[PDB]
Design a protein around this ligand. Sequence first.
Ligand SMILES: Cc1cc2nc3c(=O)[nH]c(=O)nc-3n(C[C@H](O)[C@H](O)[C@H](O)COP(=O)(O)O)c2cc1C
Ligand code: SF4
Ligand code: FES
Lengths: 213, 87, 430
Amino acid sequence: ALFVHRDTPENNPETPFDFTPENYKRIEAIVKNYPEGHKAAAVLPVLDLAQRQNGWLPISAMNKVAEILQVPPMRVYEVATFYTMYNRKPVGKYHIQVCTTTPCMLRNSDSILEAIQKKLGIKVGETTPDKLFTLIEVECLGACVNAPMVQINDNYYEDLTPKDIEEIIDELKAGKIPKPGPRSGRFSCEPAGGLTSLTEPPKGPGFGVQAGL
Amino acid sequence: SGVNNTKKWKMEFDTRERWENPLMGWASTADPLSNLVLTFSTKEDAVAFAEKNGWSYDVEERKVPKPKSKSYGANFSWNKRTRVSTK
Amino acid sequence: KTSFGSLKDEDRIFTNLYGRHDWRLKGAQSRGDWYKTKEILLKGPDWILGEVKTSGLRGRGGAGFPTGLKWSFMNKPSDGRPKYLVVNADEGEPGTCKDREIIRHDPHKLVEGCLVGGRAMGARAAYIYIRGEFYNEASNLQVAIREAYEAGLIGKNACGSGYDFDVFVVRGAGAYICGEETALIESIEGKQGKPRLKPPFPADVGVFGCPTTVANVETVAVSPTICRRGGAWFASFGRERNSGTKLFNISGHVNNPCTVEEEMSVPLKELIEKHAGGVTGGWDNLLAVIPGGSSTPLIPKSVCETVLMDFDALIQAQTGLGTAAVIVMDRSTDIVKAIARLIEFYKHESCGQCTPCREGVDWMNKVMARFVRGDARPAEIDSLWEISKQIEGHTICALGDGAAWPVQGLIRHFRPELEERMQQFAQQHQ
Ligand SMILES: Cc1cc2nc3c(=O)[nH]c(=O)nc-3n(C[C@H](O)[C@H](O)[C@H](O)COP(=O)(O)O)c2cc1C
Ligand code: SF4
Ligand code: FES
């Protein structure tokens, strides 16, 4: 939880890191989205790419991003510590992120967080000894109408009950990758028990278009 | 950063010997004017006071910070080196 | 009109809101997207800004500025720098998930909106900034953008109009403050998401120090339709100065939490009951509502009986429309704790740049945590009110205001609850 770095045998400037040749190709595409002379705009996506390859960001990975884009390391350090999606210490294979802001809290996100801890045997902020799961609370994830919900890696699992999230975790242990989305019966954000709108077939091209076009 | 101590003109005299008191180590002096500092509204008043009292003096012209050109927007220049890399 | 609501499907813009039709280009084209886009582009920026102005459209990101006037700031002769449209898809306000559905279910509405909107401003490219947690939505958008490029709808000679336009998706890395328009720009430039002071204004000095307009996803995504069906058609919905339709998120204590599109100025009670299935336990079980996302002050049940969901009506109720994120709390809710959790949210999201929010929001969080337990004295309530007024209006960005308003709403409408909790704690610890 600290915002100062101390060298350790497993995280120091001589920790091995380097982009793969395939990932170097992606960096060029990233760097070409921004005007020439403003390459520093690529720090966030390139730093995120380093995390996608390595799972997290050692100080060596940050130094490499600074080196490639030719920005001071401090400016990369500032970015890595500002945004909460960058992992500056190793996390588990499955980073379980439970939303606990008020809209999800109102719909009993507490029972979800409790169920995960009881099943995994860990506490919030901890990693399992087998290093398969890391559990943390997070702020609103932009899926409030589908609360309570969690994000595991890149996927949202929504409309959860303690039963739903235990099956999801059991699938992850089994190696199966569960499908994201609501587990209650609806497919997305539509009201449960049937659409109250958008039930009629949609109008086609040119419907209601004003005169002059 | 306060500038309220740079308004008036001051007259002070040349520094003279201070030595250690053998007993305590305190700083002793034989200069009666060692602490005498006078305040004036203008250098002309200061010079007039110095002249009638027979003191030879040096006048140092007032240093004023020059007006600066400040622009918060230059921090984000499209093509100039004034673009800051952090906030 | 006197009564607003009961919007008909023909008049809905986001006709694939629930993803039950194809979201890719073929589906979007069959639903009326990308239609006569070339004709709209050849009418020129002044004509487009005319339709947006006539429509009475106002920013859907929360602040609600009149869009037509705001977008016209860019309609000025070029000075040499490129001009950019930045589309705000950060979507960070708790209770707000409306922009998420547009990006993944109606991505081609957003892409066309960027092109049409970007044309009005004379922009060369649009940067769509999407929050990093919306990974699958960003990929859906990226697929949709490839289709438009492959069809010649964007890029060189966009739609055959002779206008060159690019659409870039840049992802965030987890920060609610990066939804603030200038902090968004700072993030695109690769710095910490810290807002800039104004002036300069983005239309003069913006992303990469170039003229820029930041526009919300919903605001941009409706511009193609307004230009096709006319500003007069859009302006025919809602009250005067509160025109159009609006996406509503209803969450909290309702039977059927959902995202729905409804006319502006729809009564709040009708919205919760017609679409969200009503308040859990019945309308009489209602305690309070947060009408426009966590930043807007809460209103109690009595105010909710007749309040309309538009900009002007909710300002009369001492709150705001905000993002139209309706968070419902019933009588079983611990209101003090609910608001306390929101202050804890703002404490975690403050960028830390400026003193009143870096120090004050953290200060408000510690006081609220004691108010939850009643571990306080009544004199501290007016202290907390005064602290909030020292933050509001004194910060660089509106996050400080957004942290102080929820506190004021609690004190304004639930002061007796705060005092009962303090009175009860003293007894148990006397
Ligand atoms: C803390 C904070 C977070 C914000 N988050 C968003 C957001 O997620 N999406 C958005 O459109 N506007 C957000 N805004 C408002 C923007 O700063 C800006 O008003 C808006 O993008 C303007 O676009 P519009 O006129 O179309 O609404 C936020 C503002 C603040 C102060
Ligand atoms: S109000 Fe808060 S979030 Fe906004 S600039 Fe100041 S410290 Fe940063
Ligand atoms: S409050 Fe949890 S997704 Fe918004």
